[PDB]
Amino acid sequence: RRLKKRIFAAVSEGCVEELVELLVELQELCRRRHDEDVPDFLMHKLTASDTGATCLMKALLNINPNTKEIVRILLAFAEENDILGRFINAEYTEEAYEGQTALNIAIERRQGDIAALLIAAGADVNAHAKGAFFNPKYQHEGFYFGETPLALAACTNQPEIVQLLMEHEQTDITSRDSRGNNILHALVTVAEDFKTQNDFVKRMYDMILLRSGNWELETTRNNDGLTPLQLAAKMGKAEILKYILSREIKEKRLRSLSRKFTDWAYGPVSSSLYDLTNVDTTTDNSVLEITVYNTNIDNRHEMLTLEPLHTLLHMKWKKFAKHMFFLSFCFYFFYNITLTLVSYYRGRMFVLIWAMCISVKEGIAIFLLDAWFHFVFFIQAVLVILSVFLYLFAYKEYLACLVLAMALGWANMLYYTRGFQSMGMYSVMIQKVILHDVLKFLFVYIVFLLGFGVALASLIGSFSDAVLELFKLTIGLGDLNIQQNSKYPILFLFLLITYVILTFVLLLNMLIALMGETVENVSKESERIWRLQRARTILEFEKMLPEWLRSRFRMGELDFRLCLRINEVKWTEWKTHVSFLN
Amino acid sequence: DGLTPLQLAAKMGKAEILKYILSREIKEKRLRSLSRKFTDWAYGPVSSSLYDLTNVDTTTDNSVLEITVYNTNIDNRHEMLTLEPLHTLLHMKWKKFAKHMFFLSFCFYFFYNITLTLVSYYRGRMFVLIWAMCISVKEGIAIFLLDAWFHFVFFIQAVLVILSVFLYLFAYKEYLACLVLAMALGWANMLYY
Amino acid sequence: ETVENVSKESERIWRLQRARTILEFEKMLPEWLRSRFRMGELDFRLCLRINEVKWTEWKTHVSFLN
Predict the structure, then answer these.
(1) Do A455 and B190 touch (CB under 8 A)?
(2) How far apart are CA A186 and CA A354, in angstroms?
(3) Sign for the pseudo-dihedral over CA of A536, A541, A547, A548
(4) How far apart are alpha carbons A97 and A87 in whole angstroms?
(5) Among B41, B177, B183, whose Cβ lies nearest the Cβ of A454?
(6) Please, how many CA atoms are within 13 Å of residue B20, restricted to the half-sphere of its CB?
(7) Helices B99-122 and B127-138, interaxial angle, to 10°?
């Protein structure tokens, strides 16, 4: 603590008159071998031991225009005192920056030449920042980049540093950190779409992938067992998965990395093949199953308009799912008609075995942990079976269960309108309106209803008669002139008028709020949620089939790779291409 | 009027100049007390900083935050309340204690309204009058303040409850009108919370 | 009249209402028990350990810088 704080101040600011004297001061200090503590003087006085911050990490933490003095201090102690083995691998002591070298801090502050010369001094590029800040809980709390130097050069938009770092012989490209992530995993972890940044991630991800040139990067699974495009699908990033699912290489010697074998193009019409490595539900964790069954991002219609993803769905649906959906509609319609005739006029009991079948079908609702129609299907099934099991008994509490099961079943018939697009967009707006705005209006209307009903019942008819008369006054009925046991009917009169005008202004406020919320949900968002609903029932009907009879996949092995004969036409793109080309 | 220059910047309602005042750092030395954002470490996106609390804190008599919250004649106060030590200070002042104090005041007003509901409907029978006197001397600063409507509804509810009780002591039948109007305005006043 | 007061102006007046009841509930407390202010003297100046993240600004900065 004698004068190492002085050299810390000298590398902080950059006064050279302390530095030139102090470099030979420590030189005559190490030349005078004190002979009571020989090795600990070097390892304790050429660094700090409170936070583990050494001199050059303090200098690169305090980057100023004094690059001459930092070139001097890399060329002062690092090679004369022969310390560089035990020195440049210094890590921290705390939990925030646990295991952080000077390479990532050197490349973090745009000093690529400093980092290239200090790895030319013989550092290690296989550092692993295992701190809990570096592996945070959410994205806001910390920086996640891959805890690797070439991964940090990938995330922080430094192509020249990763160019000089890949050409080093003993760097790793198949390296896996504490989360098991390689460069492509962390590069798509830091990524996002074009709405915020100007797409440097893909614009150097191509450089990483073709500089590597090997397939073994794109199968390295993480601790959750995910291929890099599966992790690209799960975190919700559009354009990087667009680049993955449509990627071709013109020049040869790197042809297995391509995925779009364009066999013939002619004006607007162009046939192509694609891959089915993981974009197909015959594998355990497909891309399509992830990006349909995902629930926490909202932009899934961006990914479901990509080519082998969107195209695959039509084949899976036109092929078999329209007929399977119409068959399920016909079964539910005949079940509801037999329940209608059995309920009205009193194969008399097909409804109970069908209710038991639909109950053990929808009994996975507690095992799944906007799936509301599963709950309505389950409450209809248990209400039908409770009505029948009380019909076996000698009770009169069974007809209430039958009439409520009738009301909920014939309301549940309206679930089957998805498939008619001009009625499905009408259907999902009903769910949007009851979820968002009518519940708030009911929540204010119930407390106004109680605050007037207790008042009018304290004026003395009873409670449940006055609140029923108040609701009949709301819907448009109910006499109001002279009620019994009024002290003074003037106050009853203008209390009633105050209730009616407050209900009117509440209704007006509710209708203009739900007019104010539909500035963009007029046709667009209903259409995206309808297409997502149709994709979810594609996958739900497809996985219910057994392991055989699925001869409904695509073209054979062209090593062994499934493909798709997809003929896309881009008329507007061809017209703009041949118009701007000449 | 005894105002520091950023207090006058807050009172007249100007945004970006107060943004420059509340976030100002000087890179070169010999002028360091004029800075207000001691950036101690930045690393990619994450950057910790310090700020000052010379006047942006309600422990002083005329703070900046008290001025720009209690101002009433300009409309763009949400421009200033998204500035950093101003907006950030509020979360600490609120998550810290004010959610629990607000929920406690809601529970007291809810139990007071439920005891007034049961006392009004079926006829600790008289907690409502001492709570009404407490809320009346609480909201009696409405004439001393000179869009504070809910203070007026709270005051008319308090005086209507105490007028109903002071006529209930008497032998009059003009008291039940005051009780039923106090019931209507109290259960409408629950919607303030 | 609701060409702009659909979600925006209601949100600003709600945040201003919440700030006014922050200050009204805060000034009602007595002179003691307010150990709820911020960090000590660093002459003597109180400070705040504020960790802001500007993700979009950092992305535009490192995108336009190179």
Answers:
(1) no
(2) 50
(3) negative
(4) 17
(5) B183
(6) 5
(7) 130
Method: cryo-EM
> Is residue A476 annotated as involved in ligand binding?
yes
Put simply, the chain C residues between 7 and 46 with a CB less than 8 A from any chain A CB are: 7
Count of B-C CB contacts under 8 Å: 89
Q: How many alpha carbons fall within 13 Å on the CB side of residue A531? A: 17
* Chain B interface disruption, residue of A454, A494, A497, most B CBs within 10 A: A454
Chains with ≥3 CB–CB distances under 8 Å to B: A, C
Rounded Cα distance between B81 and B154, Å, is 28
Residue written as token pair 């006055």:
A466
How many other C-beta atoms lie within 10 A of the C-beta of residue B34?
8
Q: Which amino acid is at A231?
A: L
Closest CA of chain A from C38, distance in Å: 21
A311-346 as b/e: b if 16+ CB within 10 A: bbbeebbeebbeebbeeeeeebeebbebbeebbeee
A108 CB neighbours in chain C (<8 A) are none
The end-to-end CA distance of chain C, in Å, is: 47
CB contact C53 to A (< 8 Å): yes
DSSP H/E element including B55: none
Chain position carrying tokens 């009205």: A344
Q: Contact partners of C by the rule of 3+ C-beta pairs under 8 A?
A: A, B
Q: Which two tokens stand for residue A211?
A: 């500089």
Question: H-type helices in C1-66, by residue range?
Answer: 8-27, 55-65
Position B59: which residue type? Answer: T
SS3 state at A262: strand
Which residue from A310, A286, A390, A324 is spatially nearest to A542, judged by alpha carbons?
Answer: A324
The partner residue sitting opposite C63, judged by closest CB among A139, A200, A519, is: A200
Nearest to C6 among A158, A196, A516 (CB): A516
Nearest CA to A53 among A102, A113, A13, A9?
Answer: A102
Minimal-distance CA residue of chain A relative to B121: A458
A491 secondary structure, DSSP code: H
Pairing mode, strands A269-272 and B46-49:
unpaired
> Which residues in chain C are contacts of A515 at CB distance < 8 A?
2
Tokens of A333: 């319609």
The number of C-alpha atoms within 13 Å of A189 and in the hemisphere containing its C-beta is: 25
Residue C30, C-beta contacts closer than 8 angstroms, at least 6 positions apart: none
Query: Whole-angstrom Cα distance, residue A46 to residue A50?
Result: 13
Residue A83 token pair:
């310390």
Q: Which two tokens stand for residue A256?
A: 């297995």
- For the purposes of burial, counting CB atoms within 10 Å of the CB of A165, is it exposed (0-12), middle (13-18) or buried (19 or more)? buried
3-class secondary structure, A568: strand
Resolution in A: 4.3
